[PDB]
Ligand code: CLA
Ligand SMILES: CCCCCC(=O)OC\C(C=C=C1C(C)(C)C[C@H](OC(C)=O)C[C@@]1(C)O)=C/C=C/C(C)=C/C=C/C=C(C)/C=C/C=C(\C)C(=O)C[C@@]12O[C@]1(C)C[C@@H](O)CC2(C)C
Ligand SMILES: CC(=O)O[C@H]1CC(C)(C)C(=C=C/C(C)=C/C=C/C(C)=C/C=C/C=C(C)/C=C/C=C(\C)C(=O)C[C@@]23O[C@]2(C)C[C@@H](O)CC3(C)C)[C@](C)(O)C1
Ligand SMILES: CC(=O)O[C@H]1CC(C)(C)C(=C=C/C(C)=C/C=C/C(C)=C/C=C/C=C(C)/C=C/C=C(\C)C(=O)C[C@@]23O[C@]2(C)C[C@@H](O)CC3(C)C)[C@](C)(O)C1
Ligand code: KC2
Ligand code: KC2
Ligand code: KC2
């Protein structure tokens with residue numbers, strides 16, 4: 001699996017496998033090397049997906065774009081580019097969002113639902129970022145997360161591989177862009193391009209909830 | 216040290232007024248007496264050569280960062296140590312304190328084939344650093360991995376030149392440090408520094424020993 | 426090698442940089458690195474001298490000149506110091522990308538070789554046929570004029586480039602010094618430092 005990291009040539013030629021901080025071996029929790037790089041791949045893909053979604057949400061929140069009949073539209077209509085309208089949300093709704101993400105990841109990473117689909121854990125010889133379907137405890141639950149309408153039910157393996165490479169690349173670039181936005185919001189630093197005038201969230205971006213919850 | 220000081224200097228060479236080469240030094244031996252003295256020969260040289268070159272940069276310019284900056288420059292740098300905060304003085308000594316503790320570890324020294332200096336090892340040999348609990352990019356001696364490809368003739372010439380430039384700089388900095396307080400000590404300089412506080416007292420400006 | 430160039434002046438290295446081991450490497454790649462550094466310095470100095478000659482007189486581009494013709498026209502350097510931070514930042518980023526493309530040994534191996542640890546003829550900007558862009562033309566000879574040429578003419582041009590690069594390095598250094606201290610020529614304006622300045626710190 002160490003030589004399976006030759007896919008970085010397909011991600012980008014010229015700059016091939018580039019690991020200065022050589023995390024390629026660096027045994028995590030005493031596990032094997034292939035498990036360590038599987039964790040690295042899954043963490044990279046998850047960070048890229050969340051960064052892309054956060055980028056789009058940043059643009060949305062900066063340009064307002066509220067729901068029509070939502071009664072949680074009591075947040076201020078001006079609003080910081082993003083972190084204040086997250087902060088203006090009541091704490092129970094942030095907790096419900098966080099618990100939703102945790103439930104969905106615990107669903108993604110259960111080995112019962114993974115092996116029933118036919119594909120193992122991402123550190124046990126599985127594709128990182130798979131997210132199996134719903135064989136849930138009694139719950140029909142239409143629409144899984146991935147392609148719920150079925151936009152890619154039929155697809156060649158070359159198209160899927162190219163989409164995976166594009167996903168990783170766009171995820172990296174969206175990590176860079178989203179933290180450029182958050183940097184220009186707090187102690188600007190991205191004076192090149194100025195990012196397009198984002199006010200300034202004086203507070204901490206890493207400070208969820210209005211209350212400290214003593215943790 | 217052996218009689219190979221003729222290579223370091225003819226005419227003189229193993230001058231040795233105070234004999235010091237057989238005083239048995241904690242009952243360790245005669246070879247261990249030689250090994251301790253040769254290390255303290257060049258460890259004092261390495262500090263003094265860096266401090267005298269260190270002097271000639273401090274008195275003119277300061278690093279523009281923040282904490283050890285904006286204090287006056289037209290004063291004695293021995294006084295500029297006293298203007299440092301207490302946390303800076305502790306961290307400077309303890310950082311050297313790691314380097315002293317790390318370099319004396321005989322199990323680290325036997326990784327590269329050497330031994331502790333007065334058990335038979337080379338007097339001055341800092342370890343190549345690659346055994347720490349967590350890795351670092353840059354080690355201490357030859358950080359860029361530059362001049363370790365030189366032959367033993369350049370190492371032997373350099374080791375003797377390190378000693379001879381060492382002895383010259385230990386006179387250089389201490390005679391200079393004797394000019395700051397008790398003025399007029401060196402009639403060659405006699406146009407620098409002030410302040411009568413003890414340079415051999417790092418925490419005199421902060422607290423008192425009793 | 427022996428660097429024919431000026432036949433009366435053979436070698437000339439007080440600093441014995443030629444028989445060196447820069448960053449703990451071999452002598453051949455050291456000579457290659459010095460040759461690449463002097464050629465790049467010559468090229469940059471020639472371009473800077475022409476830019477200073479064109480910016481001493483008000484010869485700004487009359488295409489649109491929304492910000493180019495804005496201020497007035499001052500200290501050749503100040504011209505740079507008056508221009509907004511985005512402009513100089515994009516210029517610096519483009520130069521960084523161009524030199525990153527120059528050193529990329531995959532594209533270089535598709536075209537030539539790198540300056541150190543290879544043959545690598547000193548100064549060779551590769552083509553633009555590998556990045557995802559059908560760019561109109563490459564950096565070296567965009568409008569095709571030297572597509573077919575003699576190798577002897579290329580060697581003579583390389584020697585002329587090195588010699589004129591040294592000459593314009595002296596010329597640009599003299600102009601920059603006379604901007605702050607008049608050495609031997611009249612017709613300077615003022616001193617406008619050297620770094621970016623104007624913002625940040
Ligand atoms: C991934 C990061 C992220 C985070 C933390 C938030 C957080 C928040 N969003 Mg938000 N949003 C995001 C991404 C994100 N958004 C993206 C990518 C979009 C574009 C589709 C939006 C569009 C959006 C709107 C239109 C509104 C919010 C609102 C809010 C706030 C109230 C919670 C809510 O109702 O969310 C609802 C948000 C979602 C359900 C989107 C998340 C689902 C995924 C990540 C993206 C959509 C997938 C797919 C295209 C679904 C089709 C559309 C579907 C939403 C109907 C809260 C601060 C509301 C607000 O400002 O209240 C003050 C509000 O009116 N968001
Ligand atoms: C839009 C871009 C269009 C580009 C068009 C173009 O192609 O560009 C032309 C080009 C490229 C080219 C080639 C061709 C020749 C054209 C054709 C060749 O083909 C062959 C030969 O086969 C190929 C090639 C690549 O070689 C290169 C251009 C180079 C250029 C423009 C070079 C200016 C130097 C200035 C100097 C040296 C002056 C310094 C200044 C000096 C020396 C001084 O001031 C002296 C000074 O004493 C003074 C006066 C006062 C004193 O007090 C002190 C000092 C010391 C300061
Ligand atoms: C000085 C300098 O450098 O510039 C400055 C200023 C500047 C330019 C502002 C900067 C910035 C910000 C940047 C560049 C931010 C970039 C953000 C970025 C790139 C955000 C990606 C989102 C991707 C998404 C949402 C993917 C959706 C994917 C979807 C909706 C899919 O379903 C994919 C799909 O495949 C499936 C799964 C199946 C296929 O059958 C069908 C398709 C293909 C549809 C910098 C670079 O930070 C710094
Ligand atoms: C080929 C290869 O391997 O690389 C080579 C080259 C290279 C890289 C440099 C190497 C290295 C390492 C280093 C860092 C070498 C640098 C060493 C360093 C920094 C050495 C300082 C000495 C300071 C002295 C002697 C001070 C004398 C001081 C004197 C004489 C005085 O002050 C006395 C005096 O004040 C009085 C008392 C009164 C005054 O009125 C008059 C004067 C001023 C006379 C290698 C690895 O070793 C070998
Ligand atoms: C909001 C988060 C998010 C974003 C922004 C995002 C963007 C992109 C982009 C554009 C940048 C591309 C081009 C792309 C491509 C593919 N995605 Mg992503 N994707 C997100 C989430 C998921 C999830 C949850 C899954 C998934 C999948 C796939 C597969 C199928 C591969 C295969 O089945 O082999 C391909 C080709 C599934 C998976 O298997 O990933 C390995 C899976 O379930 N994606 N994806
Ligand atoms: C601030 C501190 C400092 C200064 C000012 C300084 C000045 C000079 C001068 C100039 C007069 C010379 C000529 C010189 C020469 C050599 N030095 Mg110094 N040196 C300093 C520190 C160290 C340390 C920490 C080490 C070291 C070594 C060597 C070796 C042998 C390397 C080899 O044989 O592998 C040679 C030849 C290493 C060692 O001796 O190990 C065997 C080692 O670890 N040096 N050194
Ligand atoms: C091994 C390294 C070392 C050497 C070789 C060395 C040599 C000399 C010499 C010979 C030239 C003298 C004359 C001398 C004198 C004083 N030293 Mg020493 N000293 C060393 C280490 C320390 C440390 C760690 C401290 C210290 C101090 C003092 C005080 C202040 C006492 C006071 O406050 O009453 C005085 C008078 C303390 C201080 O800085 O003030 C609190 C303190 O912490 N010293 N010291």
Ligand code: KC2
Pocket residue numbers: 468469471472546547548549550565578579580581582583585586589
């Ligand atoms: C703005 C900067 C700049 C200036 C001011 C400048 C001026 C001159 C002059 C003076 C009038 C001459 C006489 C000259 C000569 C040659 N130049 Mg230069 N040149 C600059 C930059 C580049 C770059 C980027 C490349 C390049 C090239 C060549 C080649 C082809 C050799 C070959 O076929 O190998 C020859 C003969 C290519 C190269 O190979 O460099 C050696 C190439 O990529 N040049 N060049």
Ligand SMILES: CC1=C(C#C/C(C)=C/C=C/C(C)=C/C=C/C=C(C)/C=C/C=C(C)/C=C/[C@@]23O[C@]2(C)C[C@@H](O)CC3(C)C)C(C)(C)C[C@H](O)C1
Pocket residue numbers: 437438439466467469470471472473474476477480501502503504505594597598619
């Ligand atoms: C900033 C700015 C401008 C600009 C610019 C630019 C591009 C400026 C570029 C300047 C540039 C590129 C300057 C070269 C330096 C390299 C040097 C000096 C190397 C010398 C090397 C020397 C002197 C070595 C000499 C030796 O003699 C020694 C030591 C011993 C001898 O035996 C051997 C030799 C001969 C080797 C404008 C255009 C002016 C205005 C604009 O608006 C803003």
